[PDB]
Design a protein around this ligand. Sequence first.
Ligand SMILES: [Mg+2]
Ligand SMILES: [Mg+2]
Lengths: 202, 175, 151, 50, 191
Amino acid sequence: DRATWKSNYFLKIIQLLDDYPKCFIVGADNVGSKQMQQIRMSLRGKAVVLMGKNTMMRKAIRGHLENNPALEKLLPHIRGNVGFVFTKEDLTEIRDMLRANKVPAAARAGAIAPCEVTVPAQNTGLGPEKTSFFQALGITTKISRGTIEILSDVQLIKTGDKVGASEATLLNMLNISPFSFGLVIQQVFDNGSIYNPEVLDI
Amino acid sequence: MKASGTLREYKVVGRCLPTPKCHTPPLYRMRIFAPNHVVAKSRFWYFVSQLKKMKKSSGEIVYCGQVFEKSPLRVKNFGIWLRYDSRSGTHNMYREYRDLTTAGAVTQCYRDMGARHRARAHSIQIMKVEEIAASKCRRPAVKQFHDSKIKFPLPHRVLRRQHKPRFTTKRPNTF
Amino acid sequence: VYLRCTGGEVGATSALAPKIGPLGLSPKKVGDDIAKATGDWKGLRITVKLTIQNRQAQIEVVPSASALIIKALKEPPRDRKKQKNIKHSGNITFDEIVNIARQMRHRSLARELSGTIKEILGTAQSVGCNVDGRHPHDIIDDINSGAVECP
Amino acid sequence: IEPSLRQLAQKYNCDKMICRKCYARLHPRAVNCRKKKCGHTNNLRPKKKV
Amino acid sequence: MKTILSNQTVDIPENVDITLKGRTVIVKGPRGTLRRDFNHINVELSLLGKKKKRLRVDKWWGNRKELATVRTICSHVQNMIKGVTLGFRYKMRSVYAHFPINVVIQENGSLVEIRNFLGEKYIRRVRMRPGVACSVSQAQKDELILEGNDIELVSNSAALIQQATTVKNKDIRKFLDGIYVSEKGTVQQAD
RNA sequence: GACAGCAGGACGGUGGCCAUGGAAGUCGGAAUCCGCUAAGGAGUGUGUAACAACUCACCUGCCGAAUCAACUAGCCCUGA
Ligand SMILES: [Mg+2]
Ligand SMILES: [Mg+2]
């Protein structure tokens, strides 16, 4: 394997470069597989997102075909988890700002960015018992009519702090929205243009 | 073979006897390494008896000649093919040696196979000897002797065991 | 909304789901009895149940799972009383019924528009998997119809 | 009971590979018994948990 | 296979200075000085650069174990440079059982005295190395800070502490008690 | 642009199928595909009784040029 398969991947990238001359550079450092399924099945009717290896440094060979303008400006842009978004329709600057959607409350131990998490006093709706996590961290709780209320108002995880496993599970059981982060558009390419998005595009 | 001292390269040719069933034998040819030509003739009979239907009585040796080196003043690279017989079973082997002459390289081959693999001269059968060029050597030792502007000193060089008197006030500084 | 994937008979042999339920206190036996009436006649086999509650009620929605309705497309009914001859008979055609089934598959596949779902539901089965005169390994490279007519 | 300190004590006392021949505590990513009493064998097993 | 020379490259920062009379290395810096002897290894040590400070560790023919040994010189030179620029700080949290451990310093931080030790009555006195200081940390329960220059001396003092705190004649899976090395770092942060 | 190292992902059909003392990849029996694809093996293990967390094959970011596996025989070591 990985010879005819890589040649077929090169056929796919030469098909997309000969089909769609307009591209969007994106980065997906914090992303999940269900999140990518959501993004693809939300962007079926429009532009196609393609990631890849260092084999994405292929526009040099595409220039060695001797069929191009000065397209080699996009070569140092593929650094540090960089993917392409090939389009044909727009010609319209409303894409990805009306479509930049947040992540539906994905929690995992290992994140520090960007903010703090506070827990208001509210009827949590927790069944028996779900008190071992509150006892492992330290939270004053009182039991009203069957839902459990929290008597105090403290901050669990501050900025720059590593999320723990028990903290992630208690945030998942309390359903308070954790850190959520999607892809970031970084560079626009439209027919040999050099866009400087601080702040020019859209 | 004893392989006493340095080895020598011999071109030995031999044929069958002229018989009424078959005249003009094909007059075969080999390249025998031996300390002298008598051992070259006998090892020639050994190899030709193992290869084809030949023995000493129904055959003869036409010519036995010393083969001198084509370029003794050139440091060359030789690949040697080996059919030695170990304690368990025989094996095939490719070795490389950087040396001046072919007889010296095959001499180093016999001495090194006696050193490392404990192989006597009874078991070592030289299959083929070929001068190989640069950038084709498989061995890292000869590949790292392949260096232009090579630099190395001689650290801790002690010598002259009791050529000096046995009793002195000296204390020899090395290098 | 509570989810549960269990079904043989109705049961109620001192064994149930409740855990989230007794915080709202609406079922203890009445919800299990209404689940009988909402699961009558369809069928005698494992289903997926989700119950919606608004302080006094049990709304029993059955989301039709794909493999469960593929098993339900066998010869009915077989629950007990001379079972086990043996487990995997499965002689069905499913000419258009699996086609109507992935027409009913809404927002649960993350799918292409009926392009390769024929391959998906042809190779995702275990007992039947074809009309009796061909092979599903051939269906992998057979007719690509329906992908125009469904959208 | 400080479960982070319990994980630290398990890191320094529990997650080790014990050899079946020389009976020597080596390392969690060990390959051979470093002791010369068995012959540097690779007959290893993880330390037993509850 | 009698491999020809192997060389290791060491950059030396301008905060510190190196001086060698042979295989003996003397590194002087802001946080004291440190000298060591490499007499039993026989590897050439040369330096170059007019205030550029490029050390080279060069070894000729040798053997395979000795080509393994030539990297150890470069690594201990890097350890001496880090110890004379930044220093070594080991933070040891007292992972303690039902009985707490009373850790005090007695003679100017050079004598760690351990008490109450899983209910054992015997007061456990541990003497440290000349060249390492000890303290009880602030804003943290039963954390023990060991600060010094020589990594061998500091980590051998920490090894003596963690082997003095050892459960005897019992299961050591249960009774997870002892003063273990939690964090290894430097004194000057942000570097 | 590999080997090791650090960081991230490791899904949808599907809690698939034979089982109900559980199986929702993880005692077991038979198998074995498609989509998204950057990639996920109807799953190599650890577990919580199971439902869930962790990890691995596989994939991608930095690094930078040699790396990995199985046999074989000479010395030495264990077996002694
Ligand atoms: Mg006992
Ligand atoms: Mg012996």
